Amino acid sequence: KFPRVKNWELGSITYDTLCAQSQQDGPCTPRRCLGSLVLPPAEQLLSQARDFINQYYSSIKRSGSQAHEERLQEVEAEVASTGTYHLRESELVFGAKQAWRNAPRCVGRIQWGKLQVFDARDCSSAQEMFTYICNHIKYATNRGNLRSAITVFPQRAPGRGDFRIWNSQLVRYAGYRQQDGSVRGDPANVEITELCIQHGWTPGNGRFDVLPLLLQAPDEAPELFVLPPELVLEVPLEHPTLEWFAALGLRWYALPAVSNMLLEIGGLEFSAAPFSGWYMSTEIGTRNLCDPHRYNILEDVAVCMDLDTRTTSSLWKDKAAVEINLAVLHSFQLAKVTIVDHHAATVSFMKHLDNEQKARGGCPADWAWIVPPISGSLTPVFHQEMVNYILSPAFRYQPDPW
Amino acid sequence: GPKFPRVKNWELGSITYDTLCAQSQQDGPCTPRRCLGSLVLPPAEQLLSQARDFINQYYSSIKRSGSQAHEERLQEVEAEVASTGTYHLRESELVFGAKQAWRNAPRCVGRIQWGKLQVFDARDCSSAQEMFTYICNHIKYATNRGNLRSAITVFPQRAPGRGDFRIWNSQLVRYAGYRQQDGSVRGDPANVEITELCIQHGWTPGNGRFDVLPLLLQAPDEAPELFVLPPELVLEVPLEHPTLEWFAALGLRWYALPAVSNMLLEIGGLEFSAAPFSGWYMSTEIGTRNLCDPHRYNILEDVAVCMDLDTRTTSSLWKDKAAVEINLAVLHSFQLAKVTIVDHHAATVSFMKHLDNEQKARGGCPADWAWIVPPISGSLTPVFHQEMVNYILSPAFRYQPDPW
Ligand code: HEM
Ligand code: HEM
Ligand SMILES: Cc1cc(N)nc(C[C@@H]2CNC[C@@H]2OCCN[C@@H]2C[C@H]2c2cccc(Cl)c2)c1
Ligand SMILES: Cc1cc(N)nc(C[C@@H]2CNC[C@@H]2OCCN[C@@H]2C[C@H]2c2cccc(Cl)c2)c1
Ligand SMILES: C[C@H](O)[C@H](O)[C@H]1CNc2nc(N)[nH]c(=O)c2N1
Numbered sequence: 001k002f003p004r005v006k007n008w009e010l011g012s013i014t015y016d017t018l019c020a021q022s023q024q025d026g027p028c029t030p031r032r033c034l035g036s037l038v039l040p041p042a043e044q045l046l047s048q049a050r051d052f053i054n055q056y057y058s059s060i061k062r063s064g065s066q067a068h069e070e071r072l073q074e075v076e077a078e079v080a081s082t083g084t085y086h087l088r089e090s091e092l093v094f095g096a097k098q099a100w101r102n103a104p105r106c107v108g109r110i111q112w113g114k115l116q117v118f119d120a121r122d123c124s125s126a127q128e129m130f131t132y133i134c135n136h137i138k139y140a141t142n143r144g145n146l147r148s149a150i151t152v153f154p155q156r157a158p159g160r161g162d163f164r165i166w167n168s169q170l171v172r173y174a175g176y177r178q179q180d181g182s183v184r185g186d187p188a189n190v191e192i193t194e195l196c197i198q199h200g201w202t203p204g205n206g207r208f209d210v211l212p213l214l215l216q217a218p219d220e221a222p223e224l225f226v227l228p229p230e231l232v233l234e235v236p237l238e239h240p241t242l243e244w245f246a247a248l249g250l251r252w253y254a255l256p257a258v259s260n261m262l263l264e265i266g267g268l269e270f271s272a273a274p275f276s277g278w279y280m281s282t283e284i285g286t287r288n289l290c291d292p293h294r295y296n297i298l299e300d301v302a303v304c305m306d307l308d309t310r311t312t313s314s315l316w317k318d319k320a321a322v323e324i325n326l327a328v329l330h331s332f333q334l335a336k337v338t339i340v341d342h343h344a345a346t347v348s349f350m351k352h353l354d355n356e357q358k359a360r361g362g363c364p365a366d367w368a369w370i371v372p373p374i375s376g377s378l379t380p381v382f383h384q385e386m387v388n389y390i391l392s393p394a395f396r397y398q399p400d401p402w
Numbered sequence: 403g404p405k406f407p408r409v410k411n412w413e414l415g416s417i418t419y420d421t422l423c424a425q426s427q428q429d430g431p432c433t434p435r436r437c438l439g440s441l442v443l444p445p446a447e448q449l450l451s452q453a454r455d456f457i458n459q460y461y462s463s464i465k466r467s468g469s470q471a472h473e474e475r476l477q478e479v480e481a482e483v484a485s486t487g488t489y490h491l492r493e494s495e496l497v498f499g500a501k502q503a504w505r506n507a508p509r510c511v512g513r514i515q516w517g518k519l520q521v522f523d524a525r526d527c528s529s530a531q532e533m534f535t536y537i538c539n540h541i542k543y544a545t546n547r548g549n550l551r552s553a554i555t556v557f558p559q560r561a562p563g564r565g566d567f568r569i570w571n572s573q574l575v576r577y578a579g580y581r582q583q584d585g586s587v588r589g590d591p592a593n594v595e596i597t598e599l600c601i602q603h604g605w606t607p608g609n610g611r612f613d614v615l616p617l618l619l620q621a622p623d624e625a626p627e628l629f630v631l632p633p634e635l636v637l638e639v640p641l642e643h644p645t646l647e648w649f650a651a652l653g654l655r656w657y658a659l660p661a662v663s664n665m666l667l668e669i670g671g672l673e674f675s676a677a678p679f680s681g682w683y684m685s686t687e688i689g690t691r692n693l694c695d696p697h698r699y700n701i702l703e704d705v706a707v708c709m710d711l712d713t714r715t716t717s718s719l720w721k722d723k724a725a726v727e728i729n730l731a732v733l734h735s736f737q738l739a740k741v742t743i744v745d746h747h748a749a750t751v752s753f754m755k756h757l758d759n760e761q762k763a764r765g766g767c768p769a770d771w772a773w774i775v776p777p778i779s780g781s782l783t784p785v786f787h788q789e790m791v792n793y794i795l796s797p798a799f800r801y802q803p804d805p806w
């Protein structure tokens with residue numbers, strides 16, 4: 001019933017009892033594990049709502065109190081009459097923090113309790129979405145001293161289309177498909193880049209052109225808004241000892257801000273609820289810059305370092321990947337922008353596992369996403385068994401709206 | 403596509419569907435409520451059905467399915483189990499089965515080599531002394547003076563009410579771990595327990611960081627007996643670095659032959675409790691796990707100090723730079739000594755080819771993502787971007803609880 005969870009570096013054992021509170025099935029069966037896949041009525045809404053109100057009142061130590069009983073009554077009265085209901089701002093706040101807490105793929109969960117929640121449920125136009133988005137960015141960025149934040153737009157409603165941000169992140173770089181099928185800029189964004197142009201954006205021709213936002217209010221065509229350049233904090237990349245590196249013209253933006261995920265609380269769904277923390281450096285250094293279907297710079301750097309490229313066993317890839325990561329950390333530290341390296345992040349994550357063992361008897365965790373993409377077994381999370389499962393409130397992936 | 407898992411490669415965009423998982427006859431540890439994919443360790447009725455299935459497998463593989471010889475073999479297996487409670491494999495069935503157990507092993511990145519396995523049949527073995535002889539022969543053949551050859555030696559199967567053949571060591575070649583005065587370990591902390599066992603059965607211990615352990619070999623219903631391997635049989639590689647001249651001065655070394663000895667090989671419900679097998683190393687196992695794991699030789703900090711790195715802060719990436727150079731030293735040194743080794747890039751490229759071969763041959767390939775992705779430079783290798791489906795096929799290698 002309750003799985004045994006062993007750390008292989010230390011010999012210690014815990015039992016995860018939290019996984020019994022999971023009420024949604026994941027992709028695995030006893031026949032086959034699918035853990036490595038990235039994407040494998042009123043009475044039901046009513047029990048999800050009840051369960052969530054139960055979680056909220058218990059979080060403020062007021063289970064069973066008058067306020068608790070009466071709030072369950074309001075929920076039932078609203079659902080019975082209308083087929084839906086609405087959260088109080090205090091509940092939205094709690095539910096957002098909890099969705100972060102519950103997110104198995106996030107290594108930054110030590111911070112879960114410290115989240116600025118902007119309530120944007122009074123948004124009625126793409127124009128007003130844009131203003132709220134600009135304020136989020138400004139607040140979150142904070143001149144380099146990054147602060148976690150989420151802005152929550154109006155929930156899904158049975159009668160109509162969703163509020164949606166077409167971009168997968170608030171800040172991403174354009175990818176321009178070229179005459180010969182090569183790409184200038186970020187290959188991951190060729191499509192969204194092509195949508196912006198078709199909606200009348202004038203494109204740059206750089207490797208690092210910040211995309212405009214395509215914002216959609218219900219049942220409307222999306223609308224194009226250019227972010228004012230001074231709101232978008234960026235970090236030029238240079239290397240502590242390798243002088244030519246700065247001349248690569250490389251850079252990355254300060255604010256990692258995910259804008260394509262659906263936030264589910266109490267059975268209510270928030271299709272537009274962008275959120276942001278700060279980067280762990282290996283995502284820029286290793287994945288964005290070195291993935292072969294991304295900026296793919298490993299080979300260029302290796303040659304700059306005069307390494308022997310002809311053979312895999314000179315470990316030229318590993319060597320360049322390391323320097324690129326070092327350059328990311330150095331450059332962020334120099335521009336005084338918050339960032340965490342994979343060693344510090346994974347150590348904080350182990351502390352989080354321990355806090356959650358005590359607080360709730362387990363912590364859902366996706367080993368393949370937690371373990372960084374370089375130096376896996378050099379971090380303590382490599383040696384740590386993890387149980388993965390879905391708790392609610394939750395963040396969920398949603399496919400591109402086009 | 404159909405009702406079978408969709409499997410995507412995020413680097414290339416390509417898609418396949420795993421249909422082989424349909425053939426899985428054994429439950430793993432995951433359920434719809436929770437994934438346990440990351441845990442290391444999670445009778446006449448039964449035997450005959452497992453045997454029938456394996457015999458069907460063997461006959462498919464020789465293209466004689468439904469034939470007279472197929473039906474006759476099935477009838478011979480039922481009759482054997484009918485009067486003895488067990489049955490015995492033909493020589494060629496054993497060879498097929500041992501290859502298929504390797505092919506089926508989800509944690510092995512070396513499976514491109516699966517069809518090329520020397521299978522030594524040692525089902526006649528009747529003493530610990532004879533196991534020692536067979537093992538020495540395996541080591542000589544497999545090592546082949548540095549030009550390593552995949553091989554497995556299969557000792558007699560488990561029998562009704564008679565003790566097992568067991569190799570107590572987890573590998574044929576491992577270094578001792580000596581528990582010290584101050585609670586620190588000299589040698590390999592992984593082997594502290596087996597070392598104390600060898601001392602208790604009469605071994606005179608050394609006191610180095612790299613003393614080869616003797617073998618503790620158990621024949622049916624006997625205490626294990628101790629056998630020291632002649633040192634000329636155990637090929638080792640002293641470690642040096644191509645540009646950092648002081649690295650050789652560290653006196654680090656590793657052995658050439660990775661030879662696992664505590665796994666159970668299961669074939670058609672028959673259980674081979676002693677069946678040690680060997681390949682060649684993927685370098686990151688020595689360079690990263692054996693030498694840098696905090697709970698193993700743990701040398702990262704010493705090497706970073708020699709490299710003059712800032713070990714007082716995580717953001718210098720001193721761990722990452724040191725691990726890269728140790729991995730490089732391992733590759734260079736093996737290449738110098740002319741001992742077969744494969745780097746994590748070449749291994750993972752070759753496993754991607756294997757996945758494509760098996761997609762065509764069998765419609766999928768059971769694979770354990772957490773084990774296949776290497777412990778340094780994960781996303782620099784193609785396997786990081788490849789979804790994998792994990793399930794248990796038989797014939798299989800199963801982990802065995804230590805006999806002590
Ligand atoms: C405060 C600093 C934070 C750090 C250092 C951090 C770290 C990370 C990392 C490295 C990932 C994997 C990224 C990838 O490979 O795509 C991730 C995933 C994720 N994080 Fe965080 N995180 C932070 C804050 C937040 C916040 C504020 C939230 C939500 C309120 C959040 C929710 C999530 C979710 C839902 C995922 C999975 C995203 C997906 O499926 O694409 N994290 N985190
Ligand atoms: C031919 C060269 C080979 C290479 C490069 C190779 C590579 C590897 C590696 C790197 C591992 C993970 C080891 C660990 O982290 O503990 C492994 C596991 C494994 N391989 Fe291979 N392998 C080879 C040959 C073999 C052979 C000949 C067999 C059996 C016939 C085999 C069966 C296995 C099994 C059963 C495991 C899992 C062991 C465990 O769970 O502890 N492999 N392989
Ligand atoms: C198909 C698909 C499914 C899912 N679940 N995620 C994705 C997004 C895929 C999954 N890894 C790459 C791509 O995301 C890049 C964005 N990463 C977040 C910026 C980093 C981040 C870092 C620190 C804090 C925060 Cl809040 C966020 C795609
Ligand atoms: C509790 C436990 C369970 C399992 N399944 N395996 C182990 C052994 C644990 C799991 N990873 C570390 C430890 O093995 C180190 C030795 N690995 C074999 C040398 C490598 C190898 C390499 C190439 C070819 C071959 Cl035939 C074999 C322990
Ligand atoms: C196929 C595999 O699951 C996929 O490449 C995952 C692996 N681990 C990851 N880990 C993080 N943090 N982010 C990712 O995008 C991925 N990709």
Ligand SMILES: C[C@H](O)[C@H](O)[C@H]1CNc2nc(N)[nH]c(=O)c2N1
Pocket residue numbers: 008382383384385386440441442772773774
């Ligand atoms: C907890 C985790 O499953 C464990 O440390 C695994 C991860 N991946 C591994 N992969 C390989 N090849 N060998 C191992 O020993 C491990 N250890």
Ligand SMILES: [Zn+2]
Pocket residue numbers: 028032033034035432436437438439
């Ligand atoms: Zn699973």
